[PDB]
Amino acid sequence: ADFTQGADVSGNNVTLWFKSSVNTTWVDVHYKVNSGVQQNVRMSFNAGAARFEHTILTAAQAEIEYFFTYNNGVPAYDTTTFTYRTNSIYSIPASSIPQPSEGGVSLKVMNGTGGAYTDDQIYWGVIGINPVNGKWSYLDLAGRLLPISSDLNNAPGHLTKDGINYANIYHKISDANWVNLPKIESGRLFLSVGSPLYMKTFDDGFAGPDLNNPTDPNLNIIFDFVEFTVDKDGYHGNTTRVDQFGFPIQHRLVNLAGNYDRTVGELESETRSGLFAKYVNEVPYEFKSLGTLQAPYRILSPMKGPFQEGGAYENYFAGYSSISTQDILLGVGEASNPEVCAALNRHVYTEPDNWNRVDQYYQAAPANYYAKFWHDHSIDGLAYGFCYDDVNGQAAYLEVGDPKGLIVRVGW
């Protein structure tokens, strides 16, 4: 008559839950808070968590003794008594992932901030092109792609900051367990803590955060994102530090056949404060201000900092290549070939025999030490630290033809 059970803490509240693996249609919980009047409650069924739940308000600091009565078929059974008192992305069992509605992916955004923010203080949104009507759209909680427009900025419910209206396309982690992500082109999942993002939508696209503008409304918001496409060949997606680093993210993809299960992103053992501290310590002087200029909100990529044209390090690669530092960092111009770009960033350009030898990457300056840092602190050494880090399979990039679930964890 097995089940699993637990007490989930959110803020100052405790939610007792019971998840049955048998023929259960009703469950009562019997509990005492600090030895008070016994409470006997028929629990409600939460379909999206597939479990029975009862919330005890303001009991996070109390001691709670409880047991359950549930049915398996007609007969009822009592559990033993439990007492109150992971969040790892690996702890979610693949068997617990809902089957997507074809040919999509079940998406879960997960709170791994360990107390920094509650589920109702982390926001997410998905914007991309719907191949069903070719329209730029955002995703709703029912898994529908709704067209964005200029008008959406002033529609009922819209956000405003500093007397300017912005489309409200965001959801809180507490708003959902799993959401179906349908087929989608040029997709981005935006994640932000404490606040949603403030972005203008147009009839044919949107304008994201502009990190070179001193007056950008998102400059003091902590955000990050994953990029994905869901199409007829399945899921294709990645985390990215190409533009900036906002907070640690893990990205886990599981397939329908049950033979693919992979995760990329920052190691779960790295903390955000640790990363900011290690960044400024590990990187050579030229790259340090990338970690301070817009702290504590992000670490910047080199071209958002003093490596840009005119900047104090605009000629950083000068003695090593005849190709400009700006071409190298952005993979354009004389560095438009991905292999040339990558070799130059990894400082293996002048030794062709080392272009695909990972243990020789970043071993001498100049090199993209910002990029190096993300590999050093990522799962399996995989990261998108610059635009062409996928050369020789180094990028935090995953794909599978028969996707089942995608879990994206906001760490801290």
Map 47-58 to HEC letters. CCCCEEEEEECC
The rounded distance, in Å, linking the Cα atoms of 162 and 9 is: 35
On whether both 401 and 370 belong to a single domain, the answer is: no
On whether both 352 and 275 belong to a single domain, the answer is: yes
On whether both 111 and 59 belong to a single domain, the answer is: no
Query: Which DSSP helix (H) or strand (E) runs through 325?
Result: helix 325-330
CB of 67 closer than 8 Å to CB of 102 = no
- Please give the structure tokens belonging to residue 195: 């606040």
On whether both 81 and 94 belong to a single domain, the answer is: no
- Please give the structure tokens belonging to residue 74: 């007609």
The rounded distance, in Å, linking the Cα atoms of 293 and 283 is: 15
On whether both 241 and 284 belong to a single domain, the answer is: no
On whether both 301 and 412 belong to a single domain, the answer is: no
Instruction: Give the end of a domain, one of 59, 85, 111.
Output: 85
Alpha helices in 80-123 (DSSP H): none
Alpha helices in 2-108 (DSSP H): none
On whether both 72 and 114 belong to a single domain, the answer is: no
On whether both 95 and 233 belong to a single domain, the answer is: yes
The rounded distance, in Å, linking the Cα atoms of 315 and 324 is: 7
Beta bridge partners of 20: 3
CB of 136 closer than 8 Å to CB of 147 = yes
- Only one residue has tokens 């409600």, namely 44
The rounded distance, in Å, linking the Cα atoms of 164 and 97 is: 40
Instruction: Give Cβ neighbours of residue 31 (< 8 Å, ≥ 6 apart).
Output: 16, 38, 39, 41, 56, 64, 65, 66, 67
90 — phi, psi (to 5°)? -80, -15
CB of 60 closer than 8 Å to CB of 49 = no
Instruction: Give Cβ neighbours of residue 71 (< 8 Å, ≥ 6 apart).
Output: 23, 24, 25, 26, 27, 77
Beta bridge partners of 83: 65
Instruction: Give the end of a domain, one of 34, 59, 85.
Output: 85
On whether both 295 and 367 belong to a single domain, the answer is: yes
Q: How far is CA 411 from the centre of its chain?
A: 8
Q: How many domains does the chain have?
A: 3
- Residue 29 lies in domain: 1-85
Q: How far is CA 28 from the centre of its chain?
A: 36
On whether both 226 and 283 belong to a single domain, the answer is: no
CB of 276 closer than 8 Å to CB of 255 = no
On whether both 254 and 131 belong to a single domain, the answer is: yes
- Which is it for strands 403-411 and 105-112: parallel, antiparallel or unpaired? parallel
On whether both 221 and 141 belong to a single domain, the answer is: yes
Distances (CA, A) of 358 to 227, 265, 346, 376: 25, 18, 9, 12
Widest Cα–Cα separation across the chain: 81
The rounded distance, in Å, linking the Cα atoms of 63 and 34 is: 5
Beta bridge partners of 55: 15
The rounded distance, in Å, linking the Cα atoms of 310 and 60 is: 55
- Please give the structure tokens belonging to residue 130: 């719907």
Question: b or e along 220-244 (b: 16 or more beta carbons within 10 Å of the residue's beta carbon)?
Answer: ebbbbbbbbbbeeebbbbbbbbbbb
The structure was resolved experimentally with X-ray
